[PDB]
Subunit: 304 residues, 6 copies
């Protein structure tokens, strides 16, 4: 089975499009899904090899039942709201995700235009975010973002559905959350205090030693070990976005994994806390305003 | 006199920020203007040589009178509304323009963040547009955009104030207009009908012959000769922008010239027409929602303030 | 595991196509060169890496094969078959060896071509030499993006490389070449919309026409073939423009690779002889074939071990 | 005065087009000349900044009098044939030159297509050459080619007409010659013997010292001093070309100068020799098969027709 | 199953070679660093991706292996073997750990080397540090292209990575290093043709000399070795120039990776001890070895599992 | 017009600094090389254009000038003046000739240095050789962006090039070099905020600290100098990191160019001897100077006419 381009090369621009399917829009949606790979080639081919254009398409739990009969992916369910003592992860509506990436925003925009052109009248937009990465892979908090992502074979094993759900092998599960940051509060911390929040050095991106790293730092809470002592990993492609005039400074979080359990365990640790940590300290500077879960099928499933 | 970076190399990303100065905000604004070149170097220097970051700062007619106590530039006035039989060019408020360009949007965003950080509490944002160019220099209508801009010495002559206003030599005048397109109506035209609107071939960007090019084409109406028969020229750096969810497809127009009279003559021809043409056909698919005029001083004028 | 030649190359913007016939008594000289051609490719190319992207694919025709080698023949190797349609003809022309040379720059192609022909002088007669160049946005001489639906990755390997069905020749491929000359004056008299109906895709945006509007005699419709089981039958193309402005020669050099020549030959039959619904491929009303040849491109190790 | 792009950045591809103007063709030609800068922008602008497309347009002596009335450039005359004791510099016909340069051959070809499309039925092609430079600035003989070209203000002074002919300021003079090489004979020399022909080291491109450099080497014979003791300089953009099937391996020579007398003095030294040198040794491996001289006007002269 | 270190790297234009010995009592500090070296690589390199191309290959010598680890040894791990030829000598010098650091720029190499040695200060003693740079056309200090006949793709994996013959250490490799200093004055007194007879390839074009003219004591002849079964025995080299103009030091840093040290050692024996037809490799009359060490480079997961 | 050497070079990522002394009897050989150095620069660099950006700036010290030339001397040429502060010392060390070689890659620097030293062998003795590399975001070994406030364009030409004040030497410049070694262990014991107070700029974003927070003994405060007439006195710097990981040597090679040595020397006096408000530059508590030399860099035509 041929996967979608979940494992993409590094890209400096992205568009995230989340829509809901209107009553009676099902047929139009199914037609577009069968064409989205051809649209990706049409927009991208003439800008190769620098364009690096890809589109990953996902389908929500409620939408799946409206579009398809027969088997469901084993782990597909609606995003679960988490109501912590201090911080909340909200659930927001979304039936379809288009995660569009390239080396330039114009290519993302051209593909997004063709997709939405085909769906007009059949869907309602819920969210549209145009992301850009800083030139040294830093996010809006000023930390390098992506460093511990798995690569090569380890990435395939962490991200792609396999023999545990063989009809849907080559798929993946995506969790998205849009975060807005309190930059005034963040810039009031010393650099060393910021390092204790994240769990890595700011300028050099070296992980703090185990003797200094706080238990409520972001890296400590999002490190999870499996039954056998292996690291359970996800693949992230977080993107900054925002608007200077409205004072909106954001991180758009997207995490891919072979089962949603990994990502959801990380989120529970962050928002509900553990015995040793009240919550993830990154959340004292970051508010989640969307939350959705999608299954991203193998490419050949869509081509039918 | 050292000009600001009006004549920039080609860039693929831009931010246009237009603000108004709140009552009592004048001193904070003057301070920022004296530091804006230093901020540009701080954000940009470490991303050289590929970043190509620049900021051009412009000041409106009413803002000028509030900020500075001596001489005014000879051509500085508020944008003049044009009320045509069919189409209107509106005037909208704006005291400061920051025209920020680079090879990537993140550099534009970082400089815009530092600028607005210093101005918080002294200004109110009126417009913010994040622009991106298509990879073959096309605009939202699918035509190459920029081709007949002047270059080298001819660009300097067309854009920079000289001896005619010597205390402001090295400055320029910018007009901005944000345009929204009706893409559904545009895409219902045949390609040949689109070419008759613009005045150039779509795929190859070759200008149509004088025998076929209509009088109400964009290129015909924006071609102006002077008293002496010489071409009057401006320098444009138009940028696409929009939002696919809201069906917003735009062109952000910006034109620089040594005197606003050149730009204003072009706009009069477009909106009010001539003997041979009712109006520029591009306006049947393009609506202006902003309009403002600014003077962009020489860099040393900004540096030497308190 | 048998190592293929570089049939699946990265994108290249320059090519030289060299077709020669083996003179009487030239066989030994040719066999010696074939055993050295991979080493010549490395010699010319290694010092220009990683940007040079130099490769050479070497092919051998049906009649030449019997003169050079004893033992087994590849199952699908035969002379190119002439197709004599009601209006258009696909000619067959002589060729014993093909050198398909590709790089990011023409000079690298030329240096490799010079070393190869230097070794073969006196043993071969040149039949065709074409210097090809791709336009900067992957467009061909007709102004359409060319290569978009080529297969990639595993699907390309499956469509192109001989496997278990002919195990002695696994890792080989079959190449068909045809040099085409265009009537550019007639082509440019069509509207863009009418050109799109010839090809089956939009010209500017390269989006395929919807199934309800795509004509039955468009290029894309006639070259879309399904197998017995309903799977798409695919080939890998690397078509190149060529020409001479002084002689008014504007061309496309067609080269198609496939695991069996049956796929390519079925597409050619549909183009030239037509179907129930289509007289012929409308691209042929603006394109004349003046060469036609078929070659087997062995696995690299087969050439080395002789 | 705005010059044409005689002083171009380094380019790896070129097309040279030489044509003659047919009976009745003058009006069609004048129209094209007034549009050629706009054609260059149309083809090139959308491929910027990597394309680096330019076109330099030249006009021959005879053609000038057919196209324009009034003043002539002071140094414009037909190419002068040189019949040396061993080697000959031929003159061949040419009314118009288009020297098209870019980073890629497809862009050169697209501009050449638009130009010749406009001229069809008014001109006859005499020569068409598609040139490519080797990736380390080498020519067909394997030597770095271009090294001692002038740059900056020294280039402007060597190439552009100034006050000496003020109506034609910003123009230049181009000489072209297509050369075919005997590559078999060249490659039979040792590297050291090839270095003595050129006057520079082959791998490192360091000039041989004056005590070792022979008097009949290419660099010695093309080094010329003026009345004042100053170096007389030209700007060259030589390009390889060829066809492997026809065994055609060439250099297309093009040299620009403020007056043709500089280039002509170099040609006399190469073909007729000096007191100490019979001829340029490069000519024992290089045969000229074309030769033409053109004036390349300032850009505004063409625009104002 | 086993993930190799980045032995098969893309081409890189900068390198740092660091050889150290482990001081008495330094073993625990070293084991801790080895378990973190891949994390340090990501920390320095991720923010310069994708163009940085930073990698570190870590090797362990024979005597150090016994100090660090209990249990199985790699089958081919032994101390470098000194070769005492009639004229030329290959010396053995001390070295417990190798860090072979490569990237597209030297500053990335330097930053990673700084982090590594920061962790090891007080536990190791440096024996050699070389900063290498490539010439722009892949040439070495002798003016010849260097790397041409390296294997690529599948053939490289087969020649370099330990497999089923030593399954506990599958995905590992063996590295031999030698630092060479050249007598450039003697070399530059040769004619080019005499230099070509030393190396066995043409200098400007890098084409191999024919079998009839290539001397038996040329570098290429002596380092071409066939196995019992007739197959070529291959290694992967990434030689780097280095030097200091003021001290007249012009060097080649040799590093050769292979699946077993026997291949590399057979080449070294032929170079230094000769054959029946060749006293020694002529390259050694202009090149003196001043270091010599052998290391095993484990699979990446073996290092992580500490 | 006198043609300057390439003091105002584009940004380069690699450098070699070579300082030598002229041996007794070496004068003639040196004069010959000086007349050829521009020719050697073109020979090494032309074949790597346009990306190579190779340049060489040649300087001559005070004592060497009097050995090589007769007649008039540049007005400000004297030996480097040792500064003996209460805590910190700026040493003077020997040097007759400077070669400041810059390019986009180290191999071009190295090849030109090799040809220069080849011609001078036997006539000079090397005193210092440093191979410099820039970090990818223009940072120095202290982790701060280095070069941000250099002057550019016309302002740089005015700050650097000799003019009418010394008309026989117009187009020349004065270069001061100092090699600094840093105590990185002490430096990394400071917090980031304490480091920012040493330099006078924010570390990550390179924004200058406000005048109300910037200490009087910060690097930026002490190296900001105004003239009697209120003008900023500026120099042009091209500082390069260098080092050796095994010896724990981390350095900055300082080079500053100015139209008169008085500007540079005033900055050095403020740093080493202090002012009324500041004992010394706090950067010197983590930075030791181990060389110090002053050279005059003549106009290019002065060197050619020898
Ligand atoms: C909706 C807004 C606009 C769009 C999409 C647009 C687009 C274009 C295009 C595609 C061209 C042809 C290629 C080129 O030379 O750039 C052009 C030319 C031009 N436009 Fe616009 N334009 C717009 C508004 C304006 C306005 C408001 C002005 C003046 C106030 C203006 C002045 C010009 C000029 C002077 C030219 C060059 C004509 C010549 O000399 O050939 N444009 N524009
Ligand atoms: C004058 C010669 C030719 C020209 C200019 C040409 C041009 C094109 C163009 C523009 C496309 C559409 C974009 C793309 O997918 O590449 C195309 C598609 C294709 N052409 Fe050609 N073509 C030529 C000859 C041939 C010949 C001789 C064959 C087969 C024997 C062939 C087979 C194909 C195929 C299979 C496709 C892909 C159809 C699909 O599956 O969508 N073409 N060609
Ligand atoms: C037959 C084909 C020609 C070839 C292959 C050729 C090749 C070269 C080479 C390799 C160099 C040394 C590098 C350089 O400075 O560019 C050179 C220099 C030069 N060539 Fe040629 N050349 C040819 C024809 C001509 C002609 C016809 C002229 C003058 C009419 C000419 C004038 C020069 C000049 C002036 C130099 C610079 C000499 C100096 O000042 O150092 N060349 N040429
Ligand atoms: C002074 C040290 C060295 C220099 C400057 C040097 C240089 C070269 C050069 C220039 C080539 C030809 C182009 C190529 O294939 O890379 C070559 C090939 C080769 N060298 Fe070296 N070499 C050195 C030492 C060694 C050593 C010590 C070994 C083995 C232990 C070795 C093994 C090889 C091999 C295997 C080849 C490829 C031969 C073939 O199959 O064509 N070299 N070397
Ligand atoms: C000891 C090692 C040195 C280091 C690491 C160093 C580092 C820096 C840094 C990080 C900056 C701020 C960014 C910038 O504008 O460049 C700077 C500025 C400066 N440095 Fe240095 N520097 C050193 C030595 C010197 C010396 C010896 C001088 C002068 C004699 C000097 C003169 C300057 C000047 C003039 C500025 C710009 C001040 C302004 O904003 O106007 N530096 N230096």
């Amino acid at each position: 089975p041929e996967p979608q381009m979940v494992l993409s090369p590094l890209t400096s621009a992205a568009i995230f499009l989340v829509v809901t399917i209107d009553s009676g829009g099902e047929d139009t949606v199914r037609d577009l899904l069968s064409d989205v790979a051809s649209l990706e080639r049409a927009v991208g081919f003439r800008a190769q090899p620098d364009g690096r254009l890809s589109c990953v398409t996902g389908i929500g739990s409620e939408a799946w039942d409206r579009l398809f009969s027969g088997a469901r992916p084993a782990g597909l369910h609606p995003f679960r709201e988490l109501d912590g003592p201090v911080h909340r992860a909200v659930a927001t509506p979304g039936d379809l995700l288009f995660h569009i990436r390239a080396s330039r925003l114009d290519l993302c925009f051209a593909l997004a235009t063709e997709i939405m052109g085909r769906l007009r009248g059949a869907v309602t937009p819920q969210d549209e975010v145009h992301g850009f990465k800083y030139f040294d892979e830093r996010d809006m908090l000023g930390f390098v973002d992506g460093t511990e992502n798995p690569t090569g074979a380890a990435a395939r094993r962490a991200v792609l559905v396999g023999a545990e759900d063989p009809a849907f092998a080559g798929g993946s599960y995506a969790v998205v959350q849009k975060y807005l940051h309190d930059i005034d509060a963040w810039e009031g911390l010393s650099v060393e205090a910021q390092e204790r929040v994240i769990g890595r050095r700011k300028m050099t991106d070296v992980e703090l030693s185990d003797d200094v790293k706080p238990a409520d730092s972001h890296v400590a809470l999002t490190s999870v070990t499996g039954p056998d002592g292996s690291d359970l990993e996800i693949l992230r492609d977080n993107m900054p976005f925002g608007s200077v005039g409205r004072e909106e400074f954001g991180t758009y979080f997207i995490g891919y994994a072979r089962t949603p359990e990994v990502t959801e365990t990380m989120l529970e640790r962050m928002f509900l806390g553990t015995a040793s940590a009240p919550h993830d300290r990154i959340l004292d500077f970051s508010t989640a305003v969307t939350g959705s879960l999608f299954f991203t099928p193998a490419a050949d499933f869509l081509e039918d």
